[PDB]
Design a protein around this ligand. Structure first.
Ligand SMILES: Nc1nnc(-c2ccccc2O)cc1N1CCC(O)CC1
Ligand SMILES: [Cl-]
Ligand SMILES: [Zn+2]
Ligand SMILES: [Zn+2]
Length: 115
């Protein structure tokens, strides 16, 4: 894939995450756009050694930093793992983190397998 072709795929994957809603209409990605304040949420940075958010992933797409879909996927996995480490299982944030992963990998398969 050329860098320009790869970028279009990565943009479509991120878009699928950012537009996803639950049956009640809530944008499940909203909380993950921007990392919490280091001033107001210092425990997050004591616990999470490699913080990442969707804004950072979007910038990496614009910068061409990802050389494969897999590289973006690993950053999505890290975002979700961080959220699932900081938040209790069955909490809304924990569930939404898993939902972001499920959306990403479903969309990746739809793109990569379609013929
Ligand atoms: N409980 C949270 N867990 N994760 C995050 C979080 C954000 C972006 C990327 C990854 C993440 O893991 C943000 C959280 N809260 C934001 C709102 C605040 O009021 C309380 C903290
Ligand atoms: Cl992958
Ligand atoms: Zn992979
Ligand atoms: Zn097709």
């Amino acid at each position: 894939m050329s860098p320009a072709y790869l970028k279009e795929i990565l943009e479509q994957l991120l878009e699928a995450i950012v537009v996803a809603t639950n049956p009640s209409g809530r944008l499940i990605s909203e909380l993950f756009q921007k990392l919490p304040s280091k001033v107001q949420y210092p425990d997050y940075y004591a616990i999470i050694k490699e913080p990442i958010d969707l804004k950072t992933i979007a910038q990496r797409i614009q910068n061409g930093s990802y050389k494969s879909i897999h590289a973006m996927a690993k950053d999505i996995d890290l975002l979700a793992k961080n959220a699932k480490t900081y938040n209790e299982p069955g909490s809304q944030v924990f569930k939404d983190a898993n939902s972001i992963k499920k959306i990403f990998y479903m969309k990746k398969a739809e793109i990569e397998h379609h013929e």
